[PDB]
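Teaching assistant's notes for section 4

Start the section by putting this record on the projector. Ask students to predict, before seeing the second block, whether Nucleoside diphosphate-linked moiety X motif 16 will look compact or extended. Collect guesses on the board.
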Amino acid sequence: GARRLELGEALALGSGWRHVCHALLYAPDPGMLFGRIPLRYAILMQMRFDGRLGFPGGFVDTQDRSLEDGLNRELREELGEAAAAFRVERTDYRSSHVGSGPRVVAHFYAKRLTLEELLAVEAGATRAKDHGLEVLGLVRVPLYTLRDGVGGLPTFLENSFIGSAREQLLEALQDLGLLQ
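Reveal the predicted structure now:
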């Protein structure tokens, strides 16, 4: 799997279906590694309790009035109060997928931050409710490939990922024009 669904199709699914929402948070970063390698963007992922990298978010509950209300609620639980500086909205929606097995549809969003907003999220995240329990720590995604042709992004992508997070990441990187 997973199979890609249109949003209308995902929203038509029955009451037995749970909806999970995750967000790629990113900010333009003018920085240069070793003074010569463009960073391009700061992009956040999270190491989860099961030893896999993914994106912040979680499950929509029965009192969320919208997918975006659920997403923002979960992001704030996971990342803490700096996440309350912004709202991921329907304009940030990118995709929906259903895998085999449990009745879960996974919705994916990407939200542009300022670098100051992103740094605030990283700075506060260790005091979030989920820190050291369900989540183990944020990492930035290295967007460059080092001289040896392996270090940086290719190596990063050899890490362990949750569900469709690797696919979701690569699609977002494509959309940002980082994959040529």
